Amino acid sequence: AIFTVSRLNQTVRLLLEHEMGQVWISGEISNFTQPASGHWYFTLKDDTAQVRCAMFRNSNRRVTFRPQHGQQVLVRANITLYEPRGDYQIIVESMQPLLQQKYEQLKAKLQAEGLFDQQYKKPLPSPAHCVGVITSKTGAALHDILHVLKRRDPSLPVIIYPAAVQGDDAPGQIVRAIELANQRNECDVLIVGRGGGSLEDLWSFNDERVARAIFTSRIPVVSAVGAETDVTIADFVADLRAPTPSAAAEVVSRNQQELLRQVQSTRQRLEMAMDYYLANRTRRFTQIHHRLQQQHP
Amino acid sequence: AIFTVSRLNQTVRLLLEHEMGQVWISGEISNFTQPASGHWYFTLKDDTAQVRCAMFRNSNRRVTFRPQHGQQVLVRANITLYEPRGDYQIIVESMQPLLQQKYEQLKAKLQAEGLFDQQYKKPLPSPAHCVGVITSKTGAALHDILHVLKRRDPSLPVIIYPAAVQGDDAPGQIVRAIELANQRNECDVLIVGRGGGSLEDLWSFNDERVARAIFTSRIPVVSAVGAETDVTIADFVADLRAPTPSAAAEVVSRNQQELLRQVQSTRQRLEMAMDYYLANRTRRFTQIHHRLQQQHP
Amino acid sequence: KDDTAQVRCAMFRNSNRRVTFRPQHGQQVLVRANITLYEPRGDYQIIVESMQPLLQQKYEQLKAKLQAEGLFDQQYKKPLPSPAHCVGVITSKTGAA
Amino acid sequence: AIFTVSRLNQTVRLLLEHEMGQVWISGEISNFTQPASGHWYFTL
Amino acid sequence: SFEKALSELEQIVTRLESGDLPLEEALNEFERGVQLARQGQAKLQQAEQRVQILLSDNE
Amino acid sequence: SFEKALSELEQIVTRLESGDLPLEEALNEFERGVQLARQGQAKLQQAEQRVQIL
C-alpha cells in the first residue's frame, strides 16, 4: 500500500489514542503562555526532553494556584497529533503540585555499571534447607509468609532477622542484617520484602546502599516488595522477583499434597504388582494339578 | 505509573517504530535545505497535510537527481520521534520521481471490482484425475510440477498448455491459454506460473486481462508465480496461492505412496483378523475334544 | 523383552523366509515394525518388518543412573559470561569441527 | 532413534495419558473378580 | 473406483473381525479379499508405472 | 528420610515386576515395602513448624 501524507497522519493519531490513552505525567513548567481567548498553553521539560502541552478553559477552571517557571506539577493528559501540521502534543485534564526523578536517575546509573546483568545471578537451591526472612517483627509480610508456608511445607526451619522497613534509618539496618546472615552462614535462601504501601514508604529499598548489599551477597535473594504492581531497584538486583510476599513462599517451598499423592500412587502400583504376581504362580500350579488329575488310571 | 518526560518520549518512539516500521510514501517537496553537514532537511506535503523529513549523507549520495521545490516524489521511510525536542519526523532511505505505482493502481482497480473477493473462489479437486499446466513449453514451473508429481503422485496425468509468460505478448497468450483449458474442460485444476523471474516477468502476469481470465475460469486455478515474496495479480485472483510451482503440485498431487502404504496396512490386519478368527475356533473344538478324553465309556 | 517392559510381536509368512539368521531365545534382534492395537479383543501388539542382529541399553542405563544422582539439575548450572575475554576450544586439531 | 522396549512403553503411556485424558464410557460388566488386597478387576 | 474396493476390504475386516462368519462363507470371504488385495498390489504398482506415459515428462 | 524411603520403596516395586523371586522372598519383600510405605506417609504428616529470631 502506498501512503499519501493525509492517510499517514490519520493512522498515527488513531494508533496513539488507542495504545496510550490517558497517562499521568510530572515535570517542569516552561514558556507559560495564556492566550486572551481563555486557553492555557505551556511546555513541560526535563533535563533531556520536552513535549508541548495544552490545557483548555473548560478544564482550566479547576486550578487552585498560579504556575511559575520552574515549578513541579502532576498532570493527567491525553496524547494526540494535530493532523494537518504534524504536531505532537498532549491535552491536559488535571493539574496539581521530587522522588520520581530520583528513581529514574538512579536506575540508569546502576544499569550502566552492570549490577542488573544475568551473569552475576545465582540459581535458587531446591529443595531448600533453611530460609531467612528480613522484615518487621509485626509486619503483614511476616505473618502471611509463615502461614502460607505452614500449609505447603512445615518442617522447614525459618530464621527471622529483624529490622525496620520504614523510616530514614531503615536501610542501614537492612544492610547490617544481610551481612549478618552471610557471615553466620546457617541458611541457604534469603527473603527480603514487605507488604503493600505508597511510594513514600517503599523508598527504603531504592537506596544505593541496599542495592549494593543484595549484590555482593553470597546467598541467593528473592525480592517480594509491595503489591503485585510495585517495582523497586532492589527487585532488578535480586536473583528472582516474586510478585507478592505470598508468592515468595511459593517459589522457595515444596508441595506437601503433591508428595502425599506421590507416596499413595507408588503404593497402588506395589499392591497391584502382588496381585498379578500371585495369579501367575497360582495358575501355573493349577494347570500342573489338573494334569495330575487327568492321569488317573 | 507516573511518566517522566524522558520515559514518555522513549515509550512513544519504541511504540511507533515497532508498529509501523518501514513504509512507502508519496508527496511533494517543500522547504528544501542543505546545511554544511551534508544532510537534507525537507518537509513532505500534500493538499492538506505536512510531515517533517530528514535524509542523511549515505542515502542521498545515491540519488541521481537534484530535488527542487515543488516536485512529486516517492519515498521509502522510517518513522520515528526526535526526543530532545519532541518532533514527529520521518527518516528517508531512497527517493525517486513508475511500474510500482501502476501496479498499486491496478491492484486497487481490481480490488474495487471485487475480483479478489473470496466469495467467488472455488474448492480444489480432491482426489484429482487430471491437471493442466499453463507455462512455457520448457518453463521451470512445468519441470517442478512434473518433478513433484513424479515423486508424490505418479498416477496423475498432466496436460501441457504452451503459453508465453514473458514480454508484451504474455498477457494475450495467458488469457487464451486459460480460456482454451476451460473450453476443452479436460483438466480438473489449472496451475499458472512461470516460476522464478524478474519484475518484468511478474508484470507480465500483473495485467487486467489476466485477472479477468482467471476470474472467469470455471476450472479451479492455482497460481505459483515467482517465489513466496513475488505475489502477483494472478495470486490475488487465483482460488489458491502457492509459494512455488512445486508447492502447487504438492496440493494437487495425491499421497500416492501413502496410498500404497495405506492399502498395505489393511492387508496386514486382514491376516491378523484371519489368524485370530481360527484361533478361537481351534481352541473351542479342542476344549470339547478334550471333554471326550475325560468321558471314557 | 528387556528388564522392565515386554511387548507382544508377530511376524507373518510374508517375511519369515527372508530372514537370514535363525532367531533364537536370548538373541538380541533389531526390528523395524508398526505399533498397533487389535480392536476386537483389545490387545497391544506389533508387526515386524525386518530382523538383523549392545550400545543403546548402555546409554539408557547410564543416563538413569546419573539422573538419580542429580547431575542434570538446574541447581548446578552456571550462566555464561556476556563479554567473553578468552574462549577455549577442546577438539582434535586435524578435525573439521 | 532406536527404541529400547522400556522407553517405547514409556512414550506410549505418556501419549494416551496426555491426549485422551479422562472420558465417560459405558458397557457391560464381564469376568468380575476381586483379589485379597481388595482391588476390583473386570472387563467391559 | 479404486478406493471403493479398498474400503470394502476393511468392510471384510469389519465383517470378518465380527467373528460370526461360518467357516464355509468365511474362507470364501478371505479369498475375495486376497484377490481384491492382490488386485490392489497390481493397481498400486500400475499407478506407479503411469510415469512412463501419463506424466508429460517431455518438452 | 522421605526421599531415601521413596527411592528405596521404588526398588521394591522394580524387583517384583522382574518376576524371579521365590514365594518367601516375595512375601518378605512385600512386608518390607508396605511397612515402609506407612512409615513414610505418617512421618510426612507428623512434623510441624520451628522458628527462632535474632
mmCIF file of C-alpha atoms in Angstrom, chain B residues 23-297:
data_model
loop_
_atom_site.group_PDB
_atom_site.id
_atom_site.type_symbol
_atom_site.label_atom_id
_atom_site.label_comp_id
_atom_site.label_asym_id
_atom_site.label_seq_id
_atom_site.Cartn_x
_atom_site.Cartn_y
_atom_site.Cartn_z
ATOM 1 C CA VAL B 23 6.505 2.323 4.650
ATOM 2 C CA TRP B 24 6.150 3.731 1.134
ATOM 3 C CA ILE B 25 5.079 7.374 0.939
ATOM 4 C CA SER B 26 4.299 9.816 -1.856
ATOM 5 C CA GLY B 27 4.018 13.580 -1.724
ATOM 6 C CA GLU B 28 5.508 16.929 -2.664
ATOM 7 C CA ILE B 29 8.760 18.581 -1.565
ATOM 8 C CA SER B 30 8.959 21.985 0.109
ATOM 9 C CA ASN B 31 11.429 23.947 2.242
ATOM 10 C CA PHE B 32 14.415 22.081 0.845
ATOM 11 C CA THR B 33 17.536 22.848 2.883
ATOM 12 C CA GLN B 34 21.105 21.531 2.941
ATOM 13 C CA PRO B 35 23.281 22.532 5.909
ATOM 14 C CA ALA B 36 27.048 22.100 5.929
ATOM 15 C CA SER B 37 26.942 18.605 7.444
ATOM 16 C CA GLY B 38 25.582 17.218 4.158
ATOM 17 C CA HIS B 39 22.137 16.098 5.315
ATOM 18 C CA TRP B 40 18.906 17.066 3.553
ATOM 19 C CA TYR B 41 16.098 18.500 5.681
ATOM 20 C CA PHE B 42 12.802 18.998 3.868
ATOM 21 C CA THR B 43 9.066 18.896 4.501
ATOM 22 C CA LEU B 44 6.878 16.463 2.568
ATOM 23 C CA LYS B 45 3.445 17.959 1.973
ATOM 24 C CA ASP B 46 0.164 17.132 0.303
ATOM 25 C CA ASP B 47 -3.017 19.078 -0.359
ATOM 26 C CA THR B 48 -3.960 19.097 3.344
ATOM 27 C CA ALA B 49 -1.082 17.624 5.359
ATOM 28 C CA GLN B 50 2.579 18.077 6.234
ATOM 29 C CA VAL B 51 5.305 15.876 7.693
ATOM 30 C CA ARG B 52 8.947 16.572 8.518
ATOM 31 C CA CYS B 53 11.689 14.503 6.895
ATOM 32 C CA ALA B 54 15.458 14.079 7.069
ATOM 33 C CA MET B 55 17.860 12.323 4.691
ATOM 34 C CA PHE B 56 21.409 11.501 5.751
ATOM 35 C CA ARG B 57 24.612 11.616 3.721
ATOM 36 C CA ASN B 58 24.821 7.889 2.998
ATOM 37 C CA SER B 59 21.377 7.665 1.411
ATOM 38 C CA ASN B 60 21.442 10.923 -0.559
ATOM 39 C CA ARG B 61 24.725 10.018 -2.265
ATOM 40 C CA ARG B 62 22.831 7.534 -4.448
ATOM 41 C CA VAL B 63 20.038 9.918 -5.501
ATOM 42 C CA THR B 64 20.541 10.643 -9.199
ATOM 43 C CA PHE B 65 18.552 13.902 -9.389
ATOM 44 C CA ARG B 66 18.819 17.183 -7.514
ATOM 45 C CA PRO B 67 15.462 17.803 -5.790
ATOM 46 C CA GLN B 68 13.889 21.200 -6.307
ATOM 47 C CA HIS B 69 10.935 22.959 -4.741
ATOM 48 C CA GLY B 70 7.541 21.755 -5.927
ATOM 49 C CA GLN B 71 8.334 18.228 -7.129
ATOM 50 C CA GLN B 72 6.470 14.923 -6.827
ATOM 51 C CA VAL B 73 8.466 12.093 -5.239
ATOM 52 C CA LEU B 74 8.166 8.516 -3.988
ATOM 53 C CA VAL B 75 9.918 7.600 -0.747
ATOM 54 C CA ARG B 76 10.721 4.652 1.492
ATOM 55 C CA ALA B 77 10.616 5.950 5.041
ATOM 56 C CA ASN B 78 11.351 5.045 8.648
ATOM 57 C CA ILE B 79 9.016 6.669 11.179
ATOM 58 C CA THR B 80 10.462 7.888 14.479
ATOM 59 C CA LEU B 81 10.343 10.678 17.063
ATOM 60 C CA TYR B 82 13.075 13.177 17.964
ATOM 61 C CA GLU B 83 13.142 13.035 21.757
ATOM 62 C CA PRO B 84 15.132 16.155 22.776
ATOM 63 C CA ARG B 85 12.648 18.465 21.024
ATOM 64 C CA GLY B 86 9.514 16.321 20.737
ATOM 65 C CA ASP B 87 9.183 16.353 16.944
ATOM 66 C CA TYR B 88 7.464 13.703 14.829
ATOM 67 C CA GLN B 89 9.689 13.245 11.787
ATOM 68 C CA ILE B 90 10.467 10.744 9.043
ATOM 69 C CA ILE B 91 13.859 9.281 8.154
ATOM 70 C CA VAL B 92 14.260 8.666 4.422
ATOM 71 C CA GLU B 93 16.347 5.992 2.710
ATOM 72 C CA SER B 94 15.513 6.106 -1.016
ATOM 73 C CA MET B 95 13.857 8.571 -3.373
ATOM 74 C CA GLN B 96 12.661 8.778 -6.979
ATOM 75 C CA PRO B 97 10.037 10.656 -9.069
ATOM 76 C CA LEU B 98 6.611 4.101 -12.398
ATOM 77 C CA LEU B 99 5.638 0.443 -12.729
ATOM 78 C CA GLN B 100 5.373 0.160 -8.941
ATOM 79 C CA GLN B 101 2.791 2.956 -8.855
ATOM 80 C CA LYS B 102 0.875 1.422 -11.767
ATOM 81 C CA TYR B 103 0.945 -1.986 -10.075
ATOM 82 C CA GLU B 104 -0.606 -0.485 -6.941
ATOM 83 C CA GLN B 105 -3.184 1.374 -9.039
ATOM 84 C CA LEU B 106 -4.021 -1.803 -10.963
ATOM 85 C CA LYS B 107 -4.399 -3.741 -7.707
ATOM 86 C CA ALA B 108 -6.772 -1.106 -6.320
ATOM 87 C CA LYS B 109 -8.861 -1.121 -9.505
ATOM 88 C CA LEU B 110 -9.217 -4.910 -9.427
ATOM 89 C CA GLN B 111 -9.911 -4.844 -5.682
ATOM 90 C CA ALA B 112 -12.703 -2.314 -6.231
ATOM 91 C CA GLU B 113 -14.296 -4.594 -8.839
ATOM 92 C CA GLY B 114 -14.215 -7.422 -6.283
ATOM 93 C CA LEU B 115 -12.141 -9.930 -8.258
ATOM 94 C CA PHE B 116 -10.112 -10.566 -5.080
ATOM 95 C CA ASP B 117 -13.201 -11.407 -3.008
ATOM 96 C CA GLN B 118 -13.117 -14.895 -1.505
ATOM 97 C CA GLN B 119 -16.815 -15.445 -2.272
ATOM 98 C CA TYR B 120 -16.056 -16.066 -5.969
ATOM 99 C CA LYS B 121 -13.413 -18.743 -5.349
ATOM 100 C CA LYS B 122 -13.948 -22.477 -5.790
ATOM 101 C CA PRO B 123 -12.659 -25.575 -3.981
ATOM 102 C CA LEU B 124 -9.839 -27.596 -5.489
ATOM 103 C CA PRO B 125 -10.497 -31.194 -6.594
ATOM 104 C CA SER B 126 -9.577 -33.973 -4.181
ATOM 105 C CA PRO B 127 -8.586 -36.563 -5.363
ATOM 106 C CA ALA B 128 -7.612 -35.096 -8.753
ATOM 107 C CA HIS B 129 -7.768 -37.011 -12.035
ATOM 108 C CA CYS B 130 -6.164 -34.510 -14.433
ATOM 109 C CA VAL B 131 -4.162 -31.298 -14.014
ATOM 110 C CA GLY B 132 -3.495 -28.611 -16.620
ATOM 111 C CA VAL B 133 -0.275 -26.592 -16.602
ATOM 112 C CA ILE B 134 -0.191 -23.121 -18.161
ATOM 113 C CA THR B 135 3.519 -22.470 -18.690
ATOM 114 C CA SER B 136 6.077 -22.115 -21.468
ATOM 115 C CA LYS B 137 6.957 -25.324 -23.312
ATOM 116 C CA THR B 138 10.201 -25.550 -21.291
ATOM 117 C CA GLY B 139 9.434 -23.381 -18.272
ATOM 118 C CA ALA B 140 10.820 -24.064 -14.820
ATOM 119 C CA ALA B 141 7.337 -24.383 -13.308
ATOM 120 C CA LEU B 142 6.400 -27.233 -15.652
ATOM 121 C CA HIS B 143 9.539 -29.156 -14.679
ATOM 122 C CA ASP B 144 8.881 -28.501 -10.986
ATOM 123 C CA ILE B 145 5.283 -29.732 -11.258
ATOM 124 C CA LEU B 146 6.423 -32.890 -13.042
ATOM 125 C CA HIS B 147 9.220 -33.405 -10.510
ATOM 126 C CA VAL B 148 6.777 -33.221 -7.593
ATOM 127 C CA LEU B 149 4.188 -35.345 -9.399
ATOM 128 C CA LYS B 150 6.843 -37.863 -10.448
ATOM 129 C CA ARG B 151 7.536 -38.398 -6.725
ATOM 130 C CA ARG B 152 4.293 -37.787 -4.818
ATOM 131 C CA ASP B 153 1.567 -38.641 -7.365
ATOM 132 C CA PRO B 154 2.934 -40.512 -10.399
ATOM 133 C CA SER B 155 -0.625 -41.537 -11.330
ATOM 134 C CA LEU B 156 -1.978 -38.062 -12.119
ATOM 135 C CA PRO B 157 -1.855 -37.290 -15.866
ATOM 136 C CA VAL B 158 -0.522 -33.890 -16.918
ATOM 137 C CA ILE B 159 -1.657 -31.778 -19.883
ATOM 138 C CA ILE B 160 0.694 -29.039 -21.107
ATOM 139 C CA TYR B 161 -0.572 -25.696 -22.438
ATOM 140 C CA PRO B 162 2.324 -23.857 -24.141
ATOM 141 C CA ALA B 163 1.912 -20.210 -23.160
ATOM 142 C CA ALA B 164 4.109 -17.126 -23.372
ATOM 143 C CA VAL B 165 4.914 -15.939 -19.841
ATOM 144 C CA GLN B 166 7.251 -13.023 -20.613
ATOM 145 C CA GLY B 167 7.220 -9.966 -22.842
ATOM 146 C CA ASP B 168 4.354 -7.829 -24.058
ATOM 147 C CA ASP B 169 2.695 -10.862 -25.690
ATOM 148 C CA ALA B 170 2.450 -12.862 -22.447
ATOM 149 C CA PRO B 171 -0.913 -11.432 -21.255
ATOM 150 C CA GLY B 172 -2.597 -12.342 -24.538
ATOM 151 C CA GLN B 173 -1.476 -15.969 -24.516
ATOM 152 C CA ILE B 174 -2.163 -16.361 -20.787
ATOM 153 C CA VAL B 175 -5.768 -15.245 -21.297
ATOM 154 C CA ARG B 176 -6.129 -17.504 -24.337
ATOM 155 C CA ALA B 177 -4.465 -20.428 -22.553
ATOM 156 C CA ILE B 178 -6.872 -20.179 -19.609
ATOM 157 C CA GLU B 179 -9.851 -19.919 -21.962
ATOM 158 C CA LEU B 180 -8.584 -22.832 -24.062
ATOM 159 C CA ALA B 181 -8.241 -25.048 -20.984
ATOM 160 C CA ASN B 182 -11.790 -24.224 -19.875
ATOM 161 C CA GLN B 183 -13.108 -24.761 -23.408
ATOM 162 C CA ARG B 184 -11.508 -28.209 -23.549
ATOM 163 C CA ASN B 185 -12.517 -28.855 -19.915
ATOM 164 C CA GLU B 186 -10.127 -31.825 -19.794
ATOM 165 C CA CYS B 187 -8.328 -30.655 -16.621
ATOM 166 C CA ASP B 188 -9.774 -30.744 -13.109
ATOM 167 C CA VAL B 189 -7.390 -28.000 -11.926
ATOM 168 C CA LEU B 190 -5.172 -25.426 -13.638
ATOM 169 C CA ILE B 191 -1.700 -24.366 -12.472
ATOM 170 C CA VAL B 192 -0.454 -20.994 -13.745
ATOM 171 C CA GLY B 193 3.054 -19.644 -13.254
ATOM 172 C CA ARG B 194 6.444 -19.230 -14.905
ATOM 173 C CA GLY B 195 8.400 -19.779 -11.692
ATOM 174 C CA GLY B 196 11.425 -17.634 -10.943
ATOM 175 C CA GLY B 197 11.718 -14.399 -12.869
ATOM 176 C CA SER B 198 12.371 -10.682 -12.753
ATOM 177 C CA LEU B 199 9.921 -7.873 -12.007
ATOM 178 C CA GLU B 200 9.112 -7.597 -15.717
ATOM 179 C CA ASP B 201 8.159 -11.281 -15.675
ATOM 180 C CA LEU B 202 5.868 -10.525 -12.732
ATOM 181 C CA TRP B 203 4.486 -7.552 -14.670
ATOM 182 C CA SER B 204 3.602 -9.973 -17.477
ATOM 183 C CA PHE B 205 1.092 -11.563 -15.083
ATOM 184 C CA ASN B 206 0.088 -8.264 -13.414
ATOM 185 C CA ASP B 207 -2.434 -7.434 -16.129
ATOM 186 C CA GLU B 208 -6.137 -6.631 -16.019
ATOM 187 C CA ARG B 209 -6.833 -9.083 -18.849
ATOM 188 C CA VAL B 210 -5.088 -11.899 -16.968
ATOM 189 C CA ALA B 211 -7.098 -11.134 -13.825
ATOM 190 C CA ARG B 212 -10.410 -11.360 -15.684
ATOM 191 C CA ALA B 213 -9.362 -14.584 -17.420
ATOM 192 C CA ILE B 214 -8.537 -16.230 -14.088
ATOM 193 C CA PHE B 215 -11.733 -14.840 -12.555
ATOM 194 C CA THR B 216 -13.848 -16.226 -15.412
ATOM 195 C CA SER B 217 -12.002 -19.576 -15.347
ATOM 196 C CA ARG B 218 -14.660 -22.132 -14.418
ATOM 197 C CA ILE B 219 -11.955 -24.702 -13.643
ATOM 198 C CA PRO B 220 -10.143 -24.053 -10.334
ATOM 199 C CA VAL B 221 -6.896 -22.137 -10.850
ATOM 200 C CA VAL B 222 -3.745 -22.333 -8.716
ATOM 201 C CA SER B 223 -1.199 -19.519 -9.034
ATOM 202 C CA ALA B 224 2.513 -20.116 -8.406
ATOM 203 C CA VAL B 225 4.089 -17.039 -10.000
ATOM 204 C CA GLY B 226 7.530 -16.282 -8.610
ATOM 205 C CA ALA B 227 8.641 -17.082 -5.080
ATOM 206 C CA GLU B 228 6.694 -16.626 -1.839
ATOM 207 C CA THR B 229 7.601 -12.916 -1.812
ATOM 208 C CA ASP B 230 6.709 -12.437 -5.512
ATOM 209 C CA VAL B 231 2.931 -12.134 -5.085
ATOM 210 C CA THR B 232 1.194 -11.090 -8.308
ATOM 211 C CA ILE B 233 -2.287 -10.251 -9.572
ATOM 212 C CA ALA B 234 -2.854 -13.880 -10.575
ATOM 213 C CA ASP B 235 -2.167 -14.891 -6.970
ATOM 214 C CA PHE B 236 -4.776 -12.412 -5.727
ATOM 215 C CA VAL B 237 -7.396 -13.626 -8.215
ATOM 216 C CA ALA B 238 -6.479 -17.330 -8.179
ATOM 217 C CA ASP B 239 -8.522 -19.605 -5.935
ATOM 218 C CA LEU B 240 -5.319 -20.634 -4.137
ATOM 219 C CA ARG B 241 -1.802 -19.208 -3.906
ATOM 220 C CA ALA B 242 1.239 -21.494 -3.887
ATOM 221 C CA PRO B 243 4.672 -20.216 -2.784
ATOM 222 C CA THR B 244 6.381 -22.190 -5.566
ATOM 223 C CA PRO B 245 5.257 -24.327 -8.518
ATOM 224 C CA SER B 246 6.432 -27.380 -6.570
ATOM 225 C CA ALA B 247 4.086 -26.469 -3.712
ATOM 226 C CA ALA B 248 1.179 -26.161 -6.150
ATOM 227 C CA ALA B 249 1.896 -29.677 -7.416
ATOM 228 C CA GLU B 250 2.001 -30.975 -3.836
ATOM 229 C CA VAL B 251 -1.515 -29.642 -3.222
ATOM 230 C CA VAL B 252 -2.741 -31.177 -6.480
ATOM 231 C CA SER B 253 -0.663 -34.341 -6.112
ATOM 232 C CA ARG B 254 -2.145 -37.274 -4.237
ATOM 233 C CA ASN B 255 -0.223 -39.013 -1.459
ATOM 234 C CA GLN B 256 0.122 -41.972 -3.794
ATOM 235 C CA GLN B 257 2.979 -43.514 -1.821
ATOM 236 C CA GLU B 258 0.895 -43.226 1.345
ATOM 237 C CA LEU B 259 -1.984 -44.843 -0.533
ATOM 238 C CA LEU B 260 0.307 -47.777 -1.300
ATOM 239 C CA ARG B 261 1.239 -47.970 2.378
ATOM 240 C CA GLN B 262 -2.387 -47.316 3.320
ATOM 241 C CA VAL B 263 -3.542 -50.432 1.470
ATOM 242 C CA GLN B 264 -0.613 -52.445 2.816
ATOM 243 C CA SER B 265 -1.800 -51.701 6.356
ATOM 244 C CA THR B 266 -5.233 -53.166 5.624
ATOM 245 C CA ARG B 267 -3.675 -56.374 4.301
ATOM 246 C CA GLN B 268 -1.592 -56.686 7.468
ATOM 247 C CA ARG B 269 -4.615 -56.568 9.772
ATOM 248 C CA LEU B 270 -6.601 -58.816 7.435
ATOM 249 C CA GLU B 271 -4.024 -61.520 8.109
ATOM 250 C CA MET B 272 -4.291 -60.728 11.825
ATOM 251 C CA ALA B 273 -8.068 -60.957 11.572
ATOM 252 C CA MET B 274 -7.667 -64.305 9.818
ATOM 253 C CA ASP B 275 -5.361 -65.750 12.471
ATOM 254 C CA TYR B 276 -7.480 -64.584 15.398
ATOM 255 C CA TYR B 277 -10.727 -65.970 13.989
ATOM 256 C CA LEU B 278 -9.418 -69.501 13.522
ATOM 257 C CA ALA B 279 -7.565 -69.353 16.843
ATOM 258 C CA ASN B 280 -10.849 -69.084 18.743
ATOM 259 C CA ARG B 281 -12.461 -71.898 16.758
ATOM 260 C CA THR B 282 -9.479 -74.206 17.235
ATOM 261 C CA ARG B 283 -9.485 -73.602 20.986
ATOM 262 C CA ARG B 284 -13.246 -74.166 21.096
ATOM 263 C CA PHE B 285 -13.081 -77.573 19.410
ATOM 264 C CA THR B 286 -10.017 -78.608 21.412
ATOM 265 C CA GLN B 287 -11.941 -77.848 24.599
ATOM 266 C CA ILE B 288 -14.877 -80.028 23.571
ATOM 267 C CA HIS B 289 -12.488 -82.629 22.155
ATOM 268 C CA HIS B 290 -10.703 -82.926 25.498
ATOM 269 C CA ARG B 291 -14.109 -83.339 27.135
ATOM 270 C CA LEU B 292 -14.348 -86.625 25.230
ATOM 271 C CA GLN B 293 -10.985 -87.773 26.616
ATOM 272 C CA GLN B 294 -12.290 -87.447 30.171
ATOM 273 C CA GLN B 295 -15.584 -89.186 29.326
ATOM 274 C CA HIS B 296 -14.296 -92.701 28.822
ATOM 275 C CA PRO B 297 -17.259 -95.105 28.459
#
